[PDB]
């Protein structure tokens, strides 16, 4: 369902007409889905060489339309309570340090590099704080 929008070529810079099977998760992310690594594995593990053609990937997406589409339905309200845990004065803000803590120390533990990449364009105020509702909105924008 989610269109390629010429993204496949960025994953295949070596003119193979195919991309690494291990790149499938990131490809799915690039076109608009938000799969867990587990979902990616279930999709592949279900004729699938070390690579996949665009047509093979499109076939996989059509078969898994509902499950992939289900990864794009998150709402801001799903995450506010989690941030409120780190909101000392109930100001709607969290320190950049606490955000890193949340993301690298809890849940699936993102890497410090992933958090660096995430925060590259995130506004941090003069108190080292981030408006988390605005942050969530940015992360969830399609």
């Amino acid at each position: 369902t989610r269109a390629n929008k010429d993204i496949f070529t960025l994953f295949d810079k070596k003119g193979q007409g195919a991309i690494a099977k291990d790149s499938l998760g990131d490809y799915l992310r690039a076109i608009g889905y938000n799969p867990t690594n587990q979902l990616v594995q279930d999709i592949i593990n279900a004729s699938l060489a070390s690579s996949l053609t665009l047509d093979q990937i499109t076939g996989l997406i059509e078969v898994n339309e509902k499950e992939l589409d289900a990864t794009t339905k998150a709402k801001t309200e799903d995450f506010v309570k989690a941030f409120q845990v780190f909101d000392k004065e109930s100001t709607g803000k969290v320190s950049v340090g606490d955000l890193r803590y949340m993301l690298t120390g809890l849940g699936e533990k993102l890497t410090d590099a992933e958090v660096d990449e995430l925060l590259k364009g995130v506004e941090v105020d003069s108190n080292g704080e981030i408006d988390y509702k605005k942050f969530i909105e940015d992360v969830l924008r399609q």
Partner: peptide, 25 residues
């Protein structure tokens, strides 16, 4: 609970990171 909420957010963050990267590329 927070663990579940954070995991769900992390999946979306991974999505966001890749989409920003593709834009930058």
């Amino acid at each position: 609970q927070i663990s579940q909420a954070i995991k769900y957010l992390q999946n979306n963050i991974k999505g966001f990171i890749i989409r920003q990267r593709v834009n930058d590329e």
